[PDB]
Design a protein around this ligand. Structure first.
Ligand SMILES: O=c1ccn([C@@H]2O[C@H](COP(=O)(O)OP(=O)(O)O[C@H]3OC[C@@H](O)[C@H](O)[C@H]3O)[C@@H](O)[C@H]2O)c(=O)[nH]1
Ligand SMILES: O=c1ccn([C@@H]2O[C@H](COP(=O)(O)OP(=O)(O)O[C@H]3OC[C@@H](O)[C@H](O)[C@H]3O)[C@@H](O)[C@H]2O)c(=O)[nH]1
Ligand SMILES: O=c1ccn([C@@H]2O[C@H](COP(=O)(O)OP(=O)(O)O[C@H]3OC[C@@H](O)[C@H](O)[C@H]3O)[C@@H](O)[C@H]2O)c(=O)[nH]1
Ligand SMILES: O=c1ccn([C@@H]2O[C@H](COP(=O)(O)OP(=O)(O)O[C@H]3OC[C@@H](O)[C@H](O)[C@H]3O)[C@@H](O)[C@H]2O)c(=O)[nH]1
Lengths: 132, 459, 460
């Protein structure tokens, strides 16, 4: 199980055209991942269309979550693909408790900078673009 | 401060786990050894008069211990909870999709075992990965254990690769050339290593036990397997050169092998090596080298597989050419389906690949093997199977009305068949394709009988 | 029936000289005459200073020479009286035409065959003996079949030489096997048996293998390639060890304890050299391509590609450690022979490492206890670059005096006995040791305490 936080191509829109979230999700689907996708504004049906080629691989592998805590519950990794401001205000202590360990955060947007000490102390492995 | 192993649990009751733990129990009567598996029918077979694998001498070893200090069970959780030492000896299948598809090992069962061990463990335990092809196995186990701590839970991770060859497993386990144990270079690691050494010292001299760190242990196994596979591909490459120039690869091999720096083992040319070890091992070595930006090393070892694939293709096309390039509706006997003699294991057997090349030409295959189960042959070859494949109960049935007899596995019984009787009922010209050199020395008699004999590394 | 009483060997080189010296030593009733066109080489064989360095060779030659062992420039008369004529000449790689840089040039073998016919009457056995026989017996037969005389009856055998240089005398006195190929005819078998009778003066019969000439040559070509492959295989693992924190010497120990693999020829190195291995694999690859066996050709080519990569990787580690500028930096090269206990430099990795560093403008000071100074100059010349960049040192402390780095390319035993504290005091800092042979293992703590940066193959 992998949580995808953010599906719009940037924050403050519901538009997904050529969003990097599509491509990252498809790379993980090719590995057999169970994606749980949360975005505050992209409509559920748009994500289904974007990840399809009535798609059987989408049926087996893709879940659309109504909130980010449901997406992360039992997840191995949280992948942030869209820089929605709400993502840096999440309760990461609660998320960590219900994740499988080791619990990874892959910050594809640098939105969690400055939370790194807090997140490491909580117990996450934090990986971000442009830094080790 | 040290640790004494009194109870062993082995997760995985396969060709590695079953025989290895049976020999441990046999050699260490004071150690309780419990082999566990998710596969219930396999566990039931281990507890029955008909073991789930064929290994010479294994039944006698199992029956001398089972129910005294050797146990086979589906209760994985209780075996772990009580164990001092937990072996992980499960399969790591090749990925069938994603990055490294068809090449890289899938660690999902190792990781699930590691997670299951944490769940069911308290206190101190040693966890040892034992397989023929360890691919970052110790590291993945440590990663799970480092991330899932409990108060007073103290798990140590060792690497202990298994060097046995199937078909000689019991002799190999009782007199190994060496035992290899990898552990951390810390006080905790050395205490765990010594504990595992003490198990092996019940029957292995100390000078034959090598100790190192976990990665050096796994890399040594990956390299040693590849050196073995390379000898076979090397002599097989010479077998093609012999066929093209009038030499005999068996005579050339003898001359080569008398150099004591080369040694005279693993120089038996063949249709091509099979087994769950060698191809998987070289593929993973190549993939690892590519990931480390060592493309020269990757393409060096890739030749071992490319040569094996060519050896198989060349053998099949000799058969098809000898049948003048049409084999539609021609009956062909396949003698031998196991990947080598004295096992029922078919994993990556050359017999699978030769059969499929002939099925692609429309041949009607009749397959005989003294130990491979019928249903396994059906699975390995899978409508085309329904149309073209028959599983014969005996080799005379497979050869009755056949155009060609193809020997793919070096079972000793094949050199003792009534070949005069076989010739009478074959269609002519009647071919024998000896892919194992098992019929050497019968060549005059077989030619006198009237066969066309073709063998690897001689023309 | 036929007893060999006089032997002539055409070619007084690393093969012909030691081989005939041992034959003479073990067969006192056989007269052995070694001949060569090279007069200065023959004169040296007849002097207190032999033309090659082989442990034990001087003692063997001096116990036989002038008694039943002779060295002469009179090729014609040695052939005329011989019962058995060995051909042990060099077959250099073609430098132009088809197979340039890869295929053997048989012109010297053919010239020997023509000279034998010109100087022979009656019955003689002609035996080709080399470390890399490439269609040698066939080319001799080709000449003999086309140049007949009444009553001239020349028989052609193949008898490949398995000795390794530096251990030639011990190898010749106790060979793992003797391999003799001859025709499967009555005359061919009579000839084979006559040569067997020579070797049986000191080699047990069960260690003598007999076959036909082609199988004999193919067996040698393949056996050499298997040996070269073991080295490239362990060298490939050495690169993997460097990248992952393992030690190739420990991995090699674990590998070699498998009795099906064996524990010999698993010593990782800067790369194999010598007049045998590269030439042998190149000719094997070329033969396979000519037979339309491209899969076999590219299989064996990897042995050479890996060896070339091993040398290149070692040189670039040196250059990287010097931060990618070596202009005007003094670098000591310790060891120029292709292995220890010989003065032979043919295809030595030391040549290639030196040339890579010369291409970077390094000032090389080269020391080797046995390679002649003039040979190093020739090996490193295409001249002006050698004049500017190459100094040949008479002792290793002079080579290291003011050096930035010490590069060990040959495993001479004396190198582990050097005074490295003295060497460090006069080197520029940081002072590097690049051990291309693993000869300094176990000195690593001492050398690091002294202050060296030690880099070795198969360990990072
Ligand atoms: O999570 C798991 C996974 C696997 N298993 C069991 O582990 C056992 C493995 O037995 P197998 O006969 O398939 O495999 P082997 O004992 O021959 O292992 C060997 O070949 C497979 C390769 O991946 C290994 O490198 C090699 O050691 C199976 O019986 C399987 O049911 C578990 O009990 N739990
Ligand atoms: O000379 C040979 C030797 C072996 N082979 C073939 O090579 C394949 C492997 O045979 P092996 O005897 O090595 O059997 P295995 O695959 O069971 O064992 C191999 O992998 C697991 C390792 O632990 C063993 O050390 C290694 O031998 C078989 O298909 C065999 O028939 C040859 O074709 N020629
Ligand atoms: O026509 C000739 C050619 C050559 N020679 C002599 O033959 C001798 C050959 O001796 P070398 O030291 O050069 O060569 P080797 O004894 O080491 O042979 C070895 O290396 C060269 C390879 O081509 C051979 O396969 C190998 O056996 C030379 O001294 C040369 O002067 C002749 O006397 N007549
Ligand atoms: O483990 C090893 C062994 C050898 N080598 C290197 O490999 C090269 C060849 O060394 P050898 O000991 O084989 O010496 P040679 O080349 O003289 O003999 C070789 O070719 C001629 C054949 O007749 C011999 O049987 C063969 O050994 C040398 O450069 C040596 O240093 C390694 O790098 N590692």
């Amino acid at each position: 199980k992998i949580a995808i936080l953010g599906f719009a191509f940037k924050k403050d829109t519901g538009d997904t055209r050529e969003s990097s979230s599509i491509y990252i999700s498809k790379y993980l689907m090719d590995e057999g991942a169970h994606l749980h996708i949360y975005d505050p504004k992209v409509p559920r049906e748009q994500i289904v269309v974007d990840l399809s080629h009535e798609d059987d691989q989408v049926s087996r592998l893709v879940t659309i979550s109504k909130d980010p805590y449901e997406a992360c519950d039992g997840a191995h990794a949280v992948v942030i693909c869209t820089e929605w401001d709400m993502f840096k205000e999440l309760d990461y202590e609660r998320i960590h408790k219900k994740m499988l360990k080791p619990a990874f955060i892959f910050d594809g947007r640098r939105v969690l900078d400055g939370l790194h000490n807090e997140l490491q102390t909580i117990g996450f492995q934090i990986e971000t673009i442009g830094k080790k | 401060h040290m640790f004494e192993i009194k109870k062993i649990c082995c997760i995985g009751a396969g060709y590695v786990g079953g025989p290895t733990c049976s020999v441990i129990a046999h050699m260490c009567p004071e150690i309780r050894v419990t082999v566990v598996d998710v596969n219930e029918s396999r566990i039931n077979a281990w507890n029955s008069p008909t073991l789930p694998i064929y290994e010479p001498g294994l039944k006698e070893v199992v029956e001398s211990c089972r129910g005294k200090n050797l146990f086979f069970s589906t209760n994985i959780d209780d075996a772990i909870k009580e164990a001092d030492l937990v072996f992980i000896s499960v399969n790591t299948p090749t990925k069938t999709y994603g990055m490294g598809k068809g090449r890289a090992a899938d660690l999902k069962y190792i990781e699930a075992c590691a997670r299951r061990i944490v769940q069911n463990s308290n206190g101190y335990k040693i966890v040892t990965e034992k397989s023929t092809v360890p691919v970052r196995a110790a590291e993945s186990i440590r990663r799970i254990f480092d991330a899932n701590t409990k108060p007073n839970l103290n798990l140590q991770v060792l690497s202990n690769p298994e060097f046995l060859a199937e078909g000689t497993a019991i002799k190999d386990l009782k007199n190994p050339d060496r035992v290899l144990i990898g552990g951390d270079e810390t006080p905790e690691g050395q205490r765990a290593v010594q504990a595992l050494c003490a198990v092996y010292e019940h029957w292995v001299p100390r000078e034959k036990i090598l100790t190192t760190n976990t990665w050096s242990s796994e890399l040594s196994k990956l390299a040693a397997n590849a050196f073995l596979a390379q000898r076979i591909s090397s002599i097989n490459s010479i077998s093609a050169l012999c066929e093209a120039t009038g030499a005999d690869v068996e005579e050339v091999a003898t001359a080569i092998g008398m150099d004591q720096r080369i040694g005279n083992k693993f120089l038996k040319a063949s249709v091509g090596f099979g087994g769950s070890c060698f191809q998987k091992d070289v593929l993973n070595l190549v993939y690892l080298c590519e990931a480390l930006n060592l493309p020269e090393v990757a393409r060096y070892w890739q030749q071992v597989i490319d040569m094996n694939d060519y050896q198989r293709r060349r053998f099949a096309s000799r058969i098809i050419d000898s049948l003048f390039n049409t084999v539609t509706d021609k009956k062909i006997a396949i003698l031998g389906f196991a990947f080598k003699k004295d096992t029922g294991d078919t994993r990556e057997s050359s017999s699978i690949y030769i059969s499929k090349y002939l099925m692609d030409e429309g041949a009607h295959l009749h397959i005989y093997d003294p130990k491979v189960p019928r249903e396994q042959i059906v699975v390995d070859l899978s409508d085309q199977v329904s149309r073209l494949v028959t599983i014969s109960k005996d080799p005379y049935e497979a050869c009755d009305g056949a155009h060609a007899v193809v020997i793919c596995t070096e079972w000793d019984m094949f050199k003792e068949l009534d070949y005069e009787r076989i010739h009478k009922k074959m269609l002519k010209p009647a071919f024998i394709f000896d892919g194992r050199r098992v019929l050497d020395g019968l060549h005059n008699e077989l030619q006198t009988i009237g066969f066309q004999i073709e063998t690897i590394g001689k023309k």
